[PDB]
Design a protein around this ligand. Structure first.
Ligand SMILES: OC[C@H]1O[C@H](O[C@@H]2[C@@H](O)[C@@H](O)O[C@H](CO)[C@H]2O)[C@H](O)[C@@H](O)[C@@H]1O
Ligand SMILES: OC[C@H]1O[C@H](O[C@@H]2[C@@H](O)[C@@H](O)O[C@H](CO)[C@H]2O)[C@H](O)[C@@H](O)[C@@H]1O
Lengths: 729, 729
């Protein structure tokens, strides 16, 4: 209560030096209960100053002056100046007004979105402040909706300046941390809106195995249940809780077959038409909810109702879980209306996520975003994106920006959901992004033409998709370790560049560029290739330091902004000198944790990586060319070491140290080989190819090689050749 | 009161299985009085089911579940599920919310509209439900405004699925049927915003006669009254009730001359500036309304005021009716403001239509649309459209869609009203549409350059316009019979395709295509011709069955979507095998009812037509090749029979039967003649003409003729030649 101040009809709680709760109450009673958004207001004491007069109060922290002149909250009575100079005159917050600078957050869904859509604000601002209004209902101690807050205005003023990571950590302290995901969530998911049989689904899973594509999750979309078989008097077949017996004559046996293949199983649930009289569970639900069965009274969807929720979980979901369903895909698109005023999507995510923990430890849902704090109910499901280059070009930005409201587990339909147009290169670029996204779930529309199976495409596209799908499983150790860091430390897997580089203007000018964990920087290509180059491109900002392409070892001297070119089969992913990345050596092998880790080391600096696991922690240190691996607990795990180009240690057990000062630091990547390959694939004149190869071979001085390419009439070819010269400088 | 249910502060009236009145009352009193919209709530008893609990009620009909959870009406408390599967999740109505599917209705006016404008919703939805809010004032038993309803919310839930015609019939039962039009309303009207004299107007009417163009109505626009002669102290000359004596020195004599030519006469009335002190009727109105004549107090327009309305009808209109004015063109553009809150346009249409019945049986007005139920006051006047291809291309869609709110007598300015641009082909296409529209009124702006006289144009355009104007009068029997069917059975003359073909997707994809009565299907051409073809075109959907061009006999096998091409002088109008269409044999002859009917029969199927008239009903039956004509009452009428190509019976009196099994079924239309004509008019290379004529003559197999035209480099020429091959298959 030292950090609590009352003045007129207002209450101010100084939670941190940079976070102030602001309340109004007509009744002089203020709200202590949790809300849909806020789970915890216990924060360590902080120092601040007050100037309290007859008519006014000023609260002063290290970063903000908050002023209240009494009366009802207006833009004139309640306002704040930040103690920063990030702008010339955008340093003042006025109650109920917008200011410039917000770096945005996320939105409910990408349903029906072709390219960009507007986002809600987040808690991050280039000008150093943000206000997060709490407009939600209060909860009970066990987490049911209690009704309206007695704080009829309840706001959180964030004044973290450009300390974005601390703003997000303290947001997680206020709204609750993200829970740990289970390891299975981080592998490849298969999904398709397609009327598979038990037989054709298992045949497809076995084809994945034959094709060397690993999967963690088998999604079964809505054709699992009755659709066309629903009498039209009941409405549509969109909602269903009854297996189609022609396609799934023995559901538990089919789910047992997926479980024997080490797949987790989820079903699509369209909840909005509730439980109607044709459904297999209807007789039990009708008994529980005292429905008029002779008038075929439906159990209408009503998540405000405790008895409805219990019948839904116990008598509708329950029998399907007993057949082996592992977790629920909540696919809600029917609006925000309820008698309580609570969004039905929030009620579903909150209650289903809680219910999911009963049968499985660290279980998930798959559902759309339900507003600030809904990160407590992973995973995010963005929905029915339009299949286009424009949609892909929006999606990396969308994903990293979501970290600004703490929603760090978006699962996008990889390759896009529906409508749009066919382009196998779009499908391949989208999968590249997906593999370097929070979740890699392949999914598609009801079209006969939109399957994301790699072997849908030509041999080049197929092989590249298989390679990227294998890479996702190689990355599960790195992903699972980052997941435990999200849960315990409040750090997002995917960060916008400005989290690490808040004072670099270029960190705000590369919307689709992001940090992926702590060791990798990703610049997805999201534009159709230039046919004259047979390469796509993206402008990359390289921070200070020496950077390596993660795949090729091509080097780049930061700090620089440089257009980079890749063939459709290659993705721009970069690691600094000293980076250490663990990889599963056996990504196809079905085993709860890897029996073998590859330690991939980028030479040129010291580094360190901590591999967090279910039942271990393993530290890899690279210090003055000595690489050491230690673990809390011992195991039979075999460690492989790759130092730049070369495997140094194969399948060594236990803790150890090896000196790498003696070993070759340099990657094989060389200017001449890369130049020949770019000229060779280009759809340009052979005379141009001959002249460029000859002149760049003959001209010795780097500055004169650049002058030569500066004369080229092909402006994009100049930029491609300039990237090679910059790396070879 | 079995079909009436009260619950909390609500009342539900189950009017049909598919129509429910929904009311809220704070006072517990509910509204029994008629409203501006609703004239009748007497409906036959229907069966339905109720589930009534302590806190909730559910009403169940054959097609809808209506739910009310008590309290004030909100999107959460009042909602409905339809018992249809036309959509996957657009089958729920929420109070105060919009859903997808509405097929739209109409709007007040096309004043200042160049092309499309937004329309209001109608009662028709592809998803099977619509809500019609009653926001109007209550009426007295005699039809004066009584004030505010005691049902402060009063809604009609329509749940007819895709039974659009029954929805419209029951809408007419609720809001009152359309009245019968008089026969004169269905002929050609002449109108022009032009300062004619008595002499020049009669000279123009006599020129129509000399030119073989029949007219039913002589409109006199606002230059009938003082305009420039109004002193500026009184405001403008827009409103006027005083003849310009220079132009009309003897009005009654001039109107007697129009009456001797068998014309009905209407004057433009701009009511909004009321009756000012310069007007001829002002001294009488001033006496009646106790105005201060020495301060020249105006009788301001006030249709809320009983004494104003009586002075307007009796002392302003009355003297002009005594001079011979037959009906009123109410031309109101001055807004929706009144102290009552009732739109002055509604007050004008309601009261003027009632007043018009005093001197003439089944009299009309001509006025803009005044909201749902204003079909009770025909005719609709769409107003000041911009003269453009875009305006014409909107107008068929506009006209058929208006049937969805029961407003089936739109009169458009044929050829467009004002601004826009000159194109004699646009004028001709617009007249083609007009002739196949509810009303065929030629009208134009104050421009010296926008007259719709046929002889304004070149000899080709003039002759075609004269032919279409004669065709309108040939169609009056068919129109008048359809008019009596609108009045008695609630069936629109102009129907969207989806009224007849609700489950055919193509019936929703041909916006400008419509049924015209029960025997004809119209696809107006509303795009400028392709100069290379010298033909315009429209994509026609042909339903199942055998169809014939009404003019040429060109055949088409349904079901198919086919681009059809016509010269600027020809319009796509189609009749099914078995169609029977009556035509006036003597459209120029002035006679109250035709002394001679042509029965035009399309061979290939049975058919039937009922000709409703003022004092008769005549049935034409075509059954197993036997054509029979019978009538309720006998007459001297002479019947002509045309069976396909050939006149079989000329001028036969009385009831009779003739066997047509022996007679030639086939039209003359043939592929070779039509091919030669299309190639001959085309502005293409003579070498192409020669090759196409030669190859299509030489190649015998239909499939190889199509393959030949498929190679043509002119893509539109392919489609034109494909139409001929499809008809000749
Ligand atoms: O469960 C089937 C899919 O439903 C939702 O997407 C639908 C989409 O595939 C298509 O049918 O259009 C409708 C209307 O826009 C969508 O609701 C889910 O978003 C999707 O993931 C499912 O596969
Ligand atoms: O009575 C004359 C015409 O008045 C209305 O149209 C006017 C139009 O012709 C022009 O003068 O522009 C004004 C302003 O937009 C319009 O009010 C009627 O719509 C028209 O039918 C009359 O001929």
């Amino acid at each position: 209560n030292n950090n609590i101040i009352k003045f007129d009809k207002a209450r101010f709680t100084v939670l941190t030096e940079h976070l102030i709760r602001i309340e109004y109450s007509e009744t002089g009673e203020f709200e202590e209960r949790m809300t849909q958004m806020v789970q915890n207001r216990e924060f360590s004491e902080v120092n601040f100053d007050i100037i309290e007069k007859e008519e006014t109060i000023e609260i002063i922290t290290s970063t903000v002056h908050l002023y209240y002149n009494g009366g009802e909250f207006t833009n004139a009575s309640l306002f704040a100046d930040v103690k920063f100079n990030f702008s010339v005159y955008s340093n003042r917050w006025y109650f109920g007004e917008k200011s410039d600078g917000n770096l945005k957050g996320t939105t409910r869904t990408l349903d029906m979105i072709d390219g960009e859509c507007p986002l809600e604000d987040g808690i991050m601002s280039k000008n150093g402040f943000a206000v997060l209004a709490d407009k939600g209902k209060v909860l009970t101690e066990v987490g049911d909706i209690a009704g309206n807050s007695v704080s009829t205005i309840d706001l959180y003023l964030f004044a973290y300046g450009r300390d974005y990571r601390q703003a997000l950590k303290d947001f997680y302290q206020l709204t609750g941390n993200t829970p740990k995901l289970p390891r299975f969530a981080l592998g490849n998911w298969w999904s398709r809106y397609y009327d598979y049989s038990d037989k054709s689904y298992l045949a497809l899973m076995d084809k994945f195995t034959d094709k060397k594509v690993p999967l963690s999750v088998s999604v079964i979309d809505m054709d699992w249940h009755k659709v066309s078989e629903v009498p039209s008097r009941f409405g549509s077949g969109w909602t269903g809780y009854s297996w189609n017996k022609k396609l799934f004559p023995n559901p538990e046996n089919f789910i047992d077959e997926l479980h024997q293949r080490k797949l987790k199983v989820t079903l699509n649930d369209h909840p909005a038409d509730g439980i109607r009289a044709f459904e297999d569970p209807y007789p039990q639900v009708a008994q529980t909810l005292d429905l008029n069965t002779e008038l075929e009274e439906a159990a209408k969807f009503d998540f405000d109702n405790l008895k409805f929720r219990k019948a839904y979980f116990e008598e509708v979901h329950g029998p399907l879980e007993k057949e082996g369903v592992d977790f629920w895909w909540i696919d809600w698109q029917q609006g925000a209306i309820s008698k309580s005023g609570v969004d039905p999507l929030w009620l579903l995510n909150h209650y289903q996520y809680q219910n999911a923990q009963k049968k499985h430890k660290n279980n998930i849902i798959l559902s759309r975003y339900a507003g600030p704090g809904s990160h407590r109910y992973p995973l995010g499901f963005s929905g029915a994106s339009v299949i286009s280059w424009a949609s892909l070009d929006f999606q990396p930005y969308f994903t990293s920006t979501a970290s600004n409201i703490g929603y760090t587990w978006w699962s996008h339909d990889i390759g896009g959901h529906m409508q749009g147009y066919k382009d196998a290169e779009l499908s391949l670029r989208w999968l590249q992004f997906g593999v370097f996204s929070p979740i890699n779930r392949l999914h598609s529309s009801k079209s006969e033409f939109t399957s994301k199976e790699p072997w849908h495409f030509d041999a080049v596209i197929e092989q590249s998709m298989i390679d990227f799908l294998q890479l996702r499983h190689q990355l599960i150790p790195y992903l699972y370790s980052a997941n435990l860091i999200t849960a315990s430390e409040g750090r997002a897997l995917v960060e916008p560049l400005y989290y690490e580089y808040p004072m670099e203007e270029e960190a705000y000018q590369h919307r689709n560029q992001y940090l992926f964990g702590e060791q990798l920087m990703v610049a997805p290509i999201t534009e159709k290739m230039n046919s004259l180059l047979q390469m796509g491109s993206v402008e990359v900002w390289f921070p200070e330091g020496t950077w390596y392409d993660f795949f090729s070892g091509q080097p780049y001297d930061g700090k620089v902004s440089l257009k980079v070119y890749r063939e459709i089969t290659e993705m721009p992913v970069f690691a600094k000198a000293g980076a250490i990345i663990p990889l599963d050596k056996n990504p196809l092998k079905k085993e709860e944790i890897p029996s073998e880790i590859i330690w991939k080391i980028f030479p040129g600096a010291d580094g360190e990586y901590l591999l967090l696991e279910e039942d271990n922690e393993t530290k890899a240190e690279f210090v003055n060319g000595i690489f050491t691996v230690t673990s809390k607990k011992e195991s039979s795990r075999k460690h492989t070491i790759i130092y730049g180009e070369h495997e140094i240690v194969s399948a060594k057990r236990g803790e150890f140290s090896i000196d790498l000062n003696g070993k070759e630091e340099n990657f094989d990547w060389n200017f001449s080989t890369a130049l020949f390959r770019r000229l060779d694939i280009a759809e340009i004149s052979y005379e141009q190819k001959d002249e460029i190869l000859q002149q760049l071979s003959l001209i010795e001085e780097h500055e004169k090689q650049v002058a030569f390419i500066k004369t080229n009439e092909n402006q994009e070819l100049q930029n491609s050749l300039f990237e090679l010269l910059y790396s070879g400088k």
